[PDB]
mmCIF file of C-alpha atoms and ligand atoms in Angstrom:
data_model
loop_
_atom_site.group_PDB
_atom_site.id
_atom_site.type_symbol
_atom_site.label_atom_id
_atom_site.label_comp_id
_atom_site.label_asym_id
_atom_site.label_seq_id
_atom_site.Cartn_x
_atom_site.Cartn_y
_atom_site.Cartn_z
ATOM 1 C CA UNK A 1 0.000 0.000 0.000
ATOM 2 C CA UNK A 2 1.363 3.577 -0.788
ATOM 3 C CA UNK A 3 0.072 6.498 1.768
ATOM 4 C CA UNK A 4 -0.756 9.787 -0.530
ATOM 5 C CA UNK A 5 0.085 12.271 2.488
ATOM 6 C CA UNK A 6 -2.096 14.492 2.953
ATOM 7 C CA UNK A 7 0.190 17.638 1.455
ATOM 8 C CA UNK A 8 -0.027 16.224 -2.358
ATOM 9 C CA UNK A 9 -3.381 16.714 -2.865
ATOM 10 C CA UNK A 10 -3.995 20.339 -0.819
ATOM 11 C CA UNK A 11 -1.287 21.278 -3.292
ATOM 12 C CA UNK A 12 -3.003 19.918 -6.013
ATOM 13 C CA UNK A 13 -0.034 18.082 -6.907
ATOM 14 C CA UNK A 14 -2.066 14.621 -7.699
ATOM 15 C CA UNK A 15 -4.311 16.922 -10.548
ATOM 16 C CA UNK A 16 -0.712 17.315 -12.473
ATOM 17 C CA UNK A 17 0.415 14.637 -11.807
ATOM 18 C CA UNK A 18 -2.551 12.461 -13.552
ATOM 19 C CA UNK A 19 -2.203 14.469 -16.583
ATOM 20 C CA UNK A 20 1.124 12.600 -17.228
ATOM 21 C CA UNK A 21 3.628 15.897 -15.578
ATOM 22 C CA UNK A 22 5.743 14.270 -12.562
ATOM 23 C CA UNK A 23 9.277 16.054 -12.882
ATOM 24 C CA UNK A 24 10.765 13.634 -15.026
ATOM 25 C CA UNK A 25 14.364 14.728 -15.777
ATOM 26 C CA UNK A 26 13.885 17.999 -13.274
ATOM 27 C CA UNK A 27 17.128 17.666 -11.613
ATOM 28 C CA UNK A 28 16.214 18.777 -7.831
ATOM 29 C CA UNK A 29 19.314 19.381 -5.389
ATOM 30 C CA UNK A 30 18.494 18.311 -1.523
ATOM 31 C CA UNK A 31 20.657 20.587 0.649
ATOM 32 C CA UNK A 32 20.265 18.723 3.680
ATOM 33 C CA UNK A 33 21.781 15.752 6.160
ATOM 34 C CA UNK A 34 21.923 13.565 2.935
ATOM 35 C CA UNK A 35 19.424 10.854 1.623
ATOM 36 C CA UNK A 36 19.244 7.128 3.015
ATOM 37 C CA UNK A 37 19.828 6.479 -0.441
ATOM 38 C CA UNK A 38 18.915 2.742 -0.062
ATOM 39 C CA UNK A 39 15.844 3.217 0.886
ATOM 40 C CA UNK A 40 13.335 1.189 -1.480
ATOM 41 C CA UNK A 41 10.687 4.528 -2.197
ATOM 42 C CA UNK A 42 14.095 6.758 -2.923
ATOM 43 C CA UNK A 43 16.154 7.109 -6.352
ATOM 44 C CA UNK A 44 19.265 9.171 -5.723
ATOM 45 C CA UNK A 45 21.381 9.961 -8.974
ATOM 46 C CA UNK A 46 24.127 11.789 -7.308
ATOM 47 C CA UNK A 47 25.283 14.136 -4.878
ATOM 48 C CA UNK A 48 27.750 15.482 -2.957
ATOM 49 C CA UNK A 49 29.120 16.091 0.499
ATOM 50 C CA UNK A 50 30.500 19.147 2.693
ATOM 51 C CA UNK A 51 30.826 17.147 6.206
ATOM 52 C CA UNK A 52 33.697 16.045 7.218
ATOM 53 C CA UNK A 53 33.531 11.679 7.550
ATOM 54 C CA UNK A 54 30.036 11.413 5.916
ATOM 55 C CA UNK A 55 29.199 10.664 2.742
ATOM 56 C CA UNK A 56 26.428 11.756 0.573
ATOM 57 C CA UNK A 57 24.165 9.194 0.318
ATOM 58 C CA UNK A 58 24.057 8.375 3.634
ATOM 59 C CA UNK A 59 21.762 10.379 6.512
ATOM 60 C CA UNK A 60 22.518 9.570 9.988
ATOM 61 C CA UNK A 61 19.461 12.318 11.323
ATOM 62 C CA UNK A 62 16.775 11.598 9.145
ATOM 63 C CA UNK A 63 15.592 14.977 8.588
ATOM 64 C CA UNK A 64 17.187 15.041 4.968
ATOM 65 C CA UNK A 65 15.843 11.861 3.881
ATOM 66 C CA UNK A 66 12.173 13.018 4.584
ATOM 67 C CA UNK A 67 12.353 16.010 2.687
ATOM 68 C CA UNK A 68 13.171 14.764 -0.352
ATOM 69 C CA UNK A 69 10.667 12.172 0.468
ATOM 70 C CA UNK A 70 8.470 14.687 -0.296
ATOM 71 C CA UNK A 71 9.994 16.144 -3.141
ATOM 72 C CA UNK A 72 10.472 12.542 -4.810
ATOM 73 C CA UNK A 73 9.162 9.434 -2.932
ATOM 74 C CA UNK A 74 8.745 6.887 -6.089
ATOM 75 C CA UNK A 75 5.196 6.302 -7.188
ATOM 76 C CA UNK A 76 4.807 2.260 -6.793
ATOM 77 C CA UNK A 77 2.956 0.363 -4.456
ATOM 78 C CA UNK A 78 4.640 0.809 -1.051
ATOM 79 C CA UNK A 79 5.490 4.294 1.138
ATOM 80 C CA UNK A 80 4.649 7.218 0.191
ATOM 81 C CA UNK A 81 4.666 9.491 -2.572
ATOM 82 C CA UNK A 82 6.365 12.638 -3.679
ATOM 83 C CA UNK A 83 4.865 15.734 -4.860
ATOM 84 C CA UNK A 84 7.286 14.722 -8.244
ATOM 85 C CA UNK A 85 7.911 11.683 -8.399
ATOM 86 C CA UNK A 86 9.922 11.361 -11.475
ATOM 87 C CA UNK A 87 12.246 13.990 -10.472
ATOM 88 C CA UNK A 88 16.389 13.198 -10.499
ATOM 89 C CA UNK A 89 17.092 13.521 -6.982
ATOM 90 C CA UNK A 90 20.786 14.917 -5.953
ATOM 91 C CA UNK A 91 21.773 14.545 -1.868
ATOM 92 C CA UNK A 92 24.223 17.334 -1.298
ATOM 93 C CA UNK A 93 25.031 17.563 2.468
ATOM 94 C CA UNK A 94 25.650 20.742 3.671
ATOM 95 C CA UNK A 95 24.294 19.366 7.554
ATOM 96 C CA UNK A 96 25.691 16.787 9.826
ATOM 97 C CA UNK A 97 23.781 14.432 11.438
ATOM 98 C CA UNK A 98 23.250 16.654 14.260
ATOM 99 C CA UNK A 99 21.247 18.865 11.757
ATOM 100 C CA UNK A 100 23.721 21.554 11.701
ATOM 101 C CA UNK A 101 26.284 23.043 9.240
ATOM 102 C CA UNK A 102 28.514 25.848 8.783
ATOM 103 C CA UNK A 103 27.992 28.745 6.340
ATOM 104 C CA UNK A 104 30.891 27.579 4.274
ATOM 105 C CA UNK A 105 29.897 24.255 3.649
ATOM 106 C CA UNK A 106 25.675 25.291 2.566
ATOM 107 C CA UNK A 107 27.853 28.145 0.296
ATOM 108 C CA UNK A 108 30.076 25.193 -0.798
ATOM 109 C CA UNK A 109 26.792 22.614 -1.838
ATOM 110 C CA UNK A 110 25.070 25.737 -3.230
ATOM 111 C CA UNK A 111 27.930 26.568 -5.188
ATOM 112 C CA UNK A 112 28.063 22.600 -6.652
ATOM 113 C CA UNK A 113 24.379 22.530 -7.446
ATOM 114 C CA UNK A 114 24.739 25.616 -9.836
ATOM 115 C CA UNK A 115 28.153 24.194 -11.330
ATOM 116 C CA UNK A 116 26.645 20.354 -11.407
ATOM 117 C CA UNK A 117 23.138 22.245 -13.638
ATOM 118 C CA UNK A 118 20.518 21.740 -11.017
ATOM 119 C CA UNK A 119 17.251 22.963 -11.970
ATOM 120 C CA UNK A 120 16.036 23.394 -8.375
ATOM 121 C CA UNK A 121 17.852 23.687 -4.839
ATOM 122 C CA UNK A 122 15.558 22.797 -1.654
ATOM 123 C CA UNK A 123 17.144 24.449 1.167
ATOM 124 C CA UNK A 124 15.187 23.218 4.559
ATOM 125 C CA UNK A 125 17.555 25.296 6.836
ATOM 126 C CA UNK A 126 18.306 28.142 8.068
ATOM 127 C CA UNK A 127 19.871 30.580 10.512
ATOM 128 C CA UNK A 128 19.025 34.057 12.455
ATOM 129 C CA UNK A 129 21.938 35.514 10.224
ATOM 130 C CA UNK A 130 23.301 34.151 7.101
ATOM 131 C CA UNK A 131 26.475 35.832 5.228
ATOM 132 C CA UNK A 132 27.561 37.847 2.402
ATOM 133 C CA UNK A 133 29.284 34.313 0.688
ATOM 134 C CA UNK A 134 25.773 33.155 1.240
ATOM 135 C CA UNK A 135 23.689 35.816 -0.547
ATOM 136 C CA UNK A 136 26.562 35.753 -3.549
ATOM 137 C CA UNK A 137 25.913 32.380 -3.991
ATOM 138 C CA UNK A 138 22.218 32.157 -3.991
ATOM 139 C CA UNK A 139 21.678 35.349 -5.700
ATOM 140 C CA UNK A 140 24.489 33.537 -8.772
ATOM 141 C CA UNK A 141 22.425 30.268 -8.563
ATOM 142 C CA UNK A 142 19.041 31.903 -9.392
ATOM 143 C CA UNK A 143 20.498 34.041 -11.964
ATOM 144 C CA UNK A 144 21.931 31.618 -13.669
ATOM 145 C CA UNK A 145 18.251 29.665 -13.989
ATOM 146 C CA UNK A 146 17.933 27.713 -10.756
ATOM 147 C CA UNK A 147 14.669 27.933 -8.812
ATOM 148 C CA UNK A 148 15.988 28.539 -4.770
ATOM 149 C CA UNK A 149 13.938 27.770 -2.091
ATOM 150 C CA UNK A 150 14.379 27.254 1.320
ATOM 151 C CA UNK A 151 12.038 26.738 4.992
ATOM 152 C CA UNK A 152 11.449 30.409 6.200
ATOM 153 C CA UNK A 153 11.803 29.197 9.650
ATOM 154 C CA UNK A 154 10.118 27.650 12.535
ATOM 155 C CA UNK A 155 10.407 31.213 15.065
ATOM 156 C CA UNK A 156 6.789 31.992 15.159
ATOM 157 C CA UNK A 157 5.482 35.546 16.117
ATOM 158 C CA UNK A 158 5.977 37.794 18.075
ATOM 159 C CA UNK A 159 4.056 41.044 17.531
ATOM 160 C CA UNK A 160 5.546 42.894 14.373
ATOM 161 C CA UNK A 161 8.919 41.347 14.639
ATOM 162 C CA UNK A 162 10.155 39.713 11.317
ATOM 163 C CA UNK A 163 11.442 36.294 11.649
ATOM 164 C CA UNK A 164 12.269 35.043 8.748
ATOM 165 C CA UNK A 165 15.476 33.018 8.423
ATOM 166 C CA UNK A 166 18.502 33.145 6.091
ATOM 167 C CA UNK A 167 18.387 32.133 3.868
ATOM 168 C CA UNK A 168 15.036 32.257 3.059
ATOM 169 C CA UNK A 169 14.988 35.890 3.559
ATOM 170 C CA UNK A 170 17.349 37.086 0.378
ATOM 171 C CA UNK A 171 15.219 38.312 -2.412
ATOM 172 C CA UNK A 172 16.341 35.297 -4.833
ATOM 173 C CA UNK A 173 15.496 32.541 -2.301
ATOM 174 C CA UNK A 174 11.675 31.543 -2.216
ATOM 175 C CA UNK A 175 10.447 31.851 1.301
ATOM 176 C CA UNK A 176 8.391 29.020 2.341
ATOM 177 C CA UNK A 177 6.125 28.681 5.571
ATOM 178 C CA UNK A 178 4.200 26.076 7.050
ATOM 179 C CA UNK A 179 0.247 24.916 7.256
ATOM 180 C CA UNK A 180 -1.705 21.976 8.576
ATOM 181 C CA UNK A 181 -3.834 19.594 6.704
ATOM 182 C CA UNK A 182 -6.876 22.186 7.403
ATOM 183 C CA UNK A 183 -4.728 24.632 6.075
ATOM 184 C CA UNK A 184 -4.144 26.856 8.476
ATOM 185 C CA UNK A 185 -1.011 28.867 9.304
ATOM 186 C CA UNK A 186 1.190 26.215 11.793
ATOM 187 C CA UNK A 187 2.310 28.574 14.757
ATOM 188 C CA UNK A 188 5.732 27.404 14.647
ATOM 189 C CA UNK A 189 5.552 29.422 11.123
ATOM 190 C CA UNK A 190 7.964 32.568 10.667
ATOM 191 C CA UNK A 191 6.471 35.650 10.024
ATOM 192 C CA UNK A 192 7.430 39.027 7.845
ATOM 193 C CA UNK A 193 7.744 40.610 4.984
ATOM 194 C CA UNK A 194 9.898 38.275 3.187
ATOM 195 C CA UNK A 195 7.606 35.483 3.603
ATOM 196 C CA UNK A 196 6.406 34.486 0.109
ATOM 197 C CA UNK A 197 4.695 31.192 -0.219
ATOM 198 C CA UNK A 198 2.821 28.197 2.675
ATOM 199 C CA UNK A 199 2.920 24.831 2.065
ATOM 200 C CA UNK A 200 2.119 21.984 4.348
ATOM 201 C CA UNK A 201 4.057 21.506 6.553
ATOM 202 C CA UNK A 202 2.319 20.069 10.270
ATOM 203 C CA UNK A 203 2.269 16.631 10.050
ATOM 204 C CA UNK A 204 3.787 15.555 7.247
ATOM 205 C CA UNK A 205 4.581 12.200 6.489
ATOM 206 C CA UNK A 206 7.551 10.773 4.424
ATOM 207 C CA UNK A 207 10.424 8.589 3.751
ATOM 208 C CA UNK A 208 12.385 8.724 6.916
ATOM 209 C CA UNK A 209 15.944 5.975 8.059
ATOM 210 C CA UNK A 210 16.094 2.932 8.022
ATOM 211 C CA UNK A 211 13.624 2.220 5.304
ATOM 212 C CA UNK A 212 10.691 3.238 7.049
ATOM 213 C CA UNK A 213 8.199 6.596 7.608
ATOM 214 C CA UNK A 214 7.548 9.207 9.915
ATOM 215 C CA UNK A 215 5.823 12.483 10.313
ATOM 216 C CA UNK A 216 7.524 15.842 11.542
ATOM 217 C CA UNK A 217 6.424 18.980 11.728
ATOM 218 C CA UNK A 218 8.725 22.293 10.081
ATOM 219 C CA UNK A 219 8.806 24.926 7.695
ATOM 220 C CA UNK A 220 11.388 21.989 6.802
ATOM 221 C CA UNK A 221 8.437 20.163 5.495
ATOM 222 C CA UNK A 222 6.917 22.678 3.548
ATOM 223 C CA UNK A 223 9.885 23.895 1.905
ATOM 224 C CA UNK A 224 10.382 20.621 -0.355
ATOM 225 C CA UNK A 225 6.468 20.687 -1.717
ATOM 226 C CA UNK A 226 7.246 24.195 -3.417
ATOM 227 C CA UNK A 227 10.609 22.491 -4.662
ATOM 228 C CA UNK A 228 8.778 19.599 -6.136
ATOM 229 C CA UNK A 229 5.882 21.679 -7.876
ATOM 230 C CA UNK A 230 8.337 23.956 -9.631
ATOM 231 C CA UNK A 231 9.855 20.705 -10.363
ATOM 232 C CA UNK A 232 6.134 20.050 -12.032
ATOM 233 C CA UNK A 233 5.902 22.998 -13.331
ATOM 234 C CA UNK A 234 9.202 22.606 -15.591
ATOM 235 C CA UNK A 235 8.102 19.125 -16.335
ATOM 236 C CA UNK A 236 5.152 20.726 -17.978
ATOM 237 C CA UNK A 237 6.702 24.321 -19.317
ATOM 238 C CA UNK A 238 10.160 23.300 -20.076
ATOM 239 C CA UNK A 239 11.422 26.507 -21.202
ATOM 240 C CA UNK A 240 10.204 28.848 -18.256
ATOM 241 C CA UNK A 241 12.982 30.597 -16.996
ATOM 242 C CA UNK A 242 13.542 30.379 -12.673
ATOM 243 C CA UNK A 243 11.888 33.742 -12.643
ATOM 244 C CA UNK A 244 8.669 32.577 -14.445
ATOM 245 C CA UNK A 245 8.768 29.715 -12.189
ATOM 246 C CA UNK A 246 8.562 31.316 -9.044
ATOM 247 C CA UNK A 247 5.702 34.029 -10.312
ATOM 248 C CA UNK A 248 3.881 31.361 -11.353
ATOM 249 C CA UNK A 249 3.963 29.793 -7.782
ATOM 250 C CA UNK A 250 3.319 32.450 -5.534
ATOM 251 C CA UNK A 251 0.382 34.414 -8.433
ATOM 252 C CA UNK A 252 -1.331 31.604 -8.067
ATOM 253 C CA UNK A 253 -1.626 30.842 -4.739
ATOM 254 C CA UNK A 254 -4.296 30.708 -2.523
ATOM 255 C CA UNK A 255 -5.076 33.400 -0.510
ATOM 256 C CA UNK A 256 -5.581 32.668 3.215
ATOM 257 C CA UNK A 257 -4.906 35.705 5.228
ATOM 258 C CA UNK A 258 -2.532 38.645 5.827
ATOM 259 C CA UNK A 259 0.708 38.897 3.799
ATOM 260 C CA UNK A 260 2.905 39.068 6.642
ATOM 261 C CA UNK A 261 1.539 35.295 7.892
ATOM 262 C CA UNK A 262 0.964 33.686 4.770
ATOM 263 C CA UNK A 263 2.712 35.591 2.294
ATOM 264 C CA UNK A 264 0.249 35.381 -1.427
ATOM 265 C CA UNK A 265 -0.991 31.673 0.321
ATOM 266 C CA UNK A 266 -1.121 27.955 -0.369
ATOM 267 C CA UNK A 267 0.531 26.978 -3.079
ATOM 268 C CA UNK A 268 -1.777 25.946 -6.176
ATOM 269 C CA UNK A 269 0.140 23.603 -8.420
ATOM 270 C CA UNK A 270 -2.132 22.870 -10.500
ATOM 271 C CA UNK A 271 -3.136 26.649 -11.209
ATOM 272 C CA UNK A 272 0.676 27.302 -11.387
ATOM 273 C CA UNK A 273 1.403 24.698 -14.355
ATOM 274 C CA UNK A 274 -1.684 25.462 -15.900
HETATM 275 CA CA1 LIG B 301 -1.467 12.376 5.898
HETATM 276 CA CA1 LIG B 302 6.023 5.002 -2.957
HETATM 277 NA NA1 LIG B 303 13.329 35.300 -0.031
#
């Protein structure tokens, strides 16, 4: 039995999907702890690694192995199932298995996605300050046509204070917070005016070590759905350019509230690869 979590069809994911558009050949970097790459619902192509002793396709936390989960869980008969399936999935760890990395080695896998021709870079991560190496690198990787997005972060509110994380919060990075499956705003969800785009991101399910699945909760989990649907999107409109990408996404959302919590709303993929 494969699980659809609940995420792929409040995204609309499963309409584009049926119509035969799944990512194929969309080659999606995971900037994360790496990807249990033997895991049976996971096809890693390649990758790279920025930690010291561990390689690539290995993830001793977990947390990068269910975000791309979510990106890319294989449509078959058993797990779950990824918002694009079909996608070419690339672990570059930038995170140890403590979940945390320096800015050098996220500027370092950044750096090898735009070299290596990624068309998208998930970033679930983030920091209360990021770094001018940082910016340089993510600004050079969306101008030379690579769709960035990373987890706006998991600070809440707190009256008008912004708190957004970096990377999310440079201009060429798609800022990505966090519903439930009723689609409301998760209050773990950063806040402010960088925020651009929700996606689910309370209890979602997906590939997780050693070949099993578990839920967590995180802008960390929303992050990878807006990944995976520009993924669809290019699988569909092959000659969009990252910029067209990300209009399309965040035009077409749906509106749920207040800019500053929600930026434009849900993501619609369906409306966005129409
Ligand atoms: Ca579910
Ligand atoms: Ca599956
Ligand atoms: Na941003």
């Amino acid at each position: 039995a494969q699980t659809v979590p609940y995420g792929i069809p409040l995204i609309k994911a499963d309409k584009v999907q049926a119509q035969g558009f799944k990512g194929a050949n969309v080659k999606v970097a995971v900037l994360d702890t790496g990807i249990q790459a033997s895991h049976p619902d996971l096809n890693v192509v390649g990758g790279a690694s920025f930690v010291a002793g561990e390689a690539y396709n290995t993830d001793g936390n977990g947390h990068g192995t269910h975000v791309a989960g979510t990106v890319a869980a294989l449509d078959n008969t058993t797990g779950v199932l990824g918002v694009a399936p079909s996608v070419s999935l690339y672990a570059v760890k930038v995170l140890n298995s403590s979940g945390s990395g320096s800015y050098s080695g996220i500027v370092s896998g950044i750096e090898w996605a735009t070299t290596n021709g990624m068309d998208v870079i998930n970033m679930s991560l983030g920091g209360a300050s990021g770094s001018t190496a940082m910016k340089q690198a993510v600004d050079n990787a969306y101008a030379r046509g690579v769709v960035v997005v990373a987890a706006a972060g998991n600070s809440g509110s707190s009256g008008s204070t912004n708190t957004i994380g970096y990377p999310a919060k440079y201009d060429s990075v798609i800022a990505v917070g966090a519903v439930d499956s009723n689609s409301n705003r998760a209050s773990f969800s950063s806040v402010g005016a960088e925020l651009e785009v929700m996606a689910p991101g309370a209890g979602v399910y997906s590939t997780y070590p050693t070949n099993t699945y578990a839920t967590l909760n995180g802008t960390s989990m929303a992050s990878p759905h807006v990944a995976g649907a520009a993924a669809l999107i290019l699988s569909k409109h092959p000659n969009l350019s990252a910029s067209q990408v990300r209009n399309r996404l965040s035009s077409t959302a749906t509106y749920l509230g207040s800019s500053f919590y929600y930026g434009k709303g849900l993501i619609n993929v369906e409306a966005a690869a129409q």
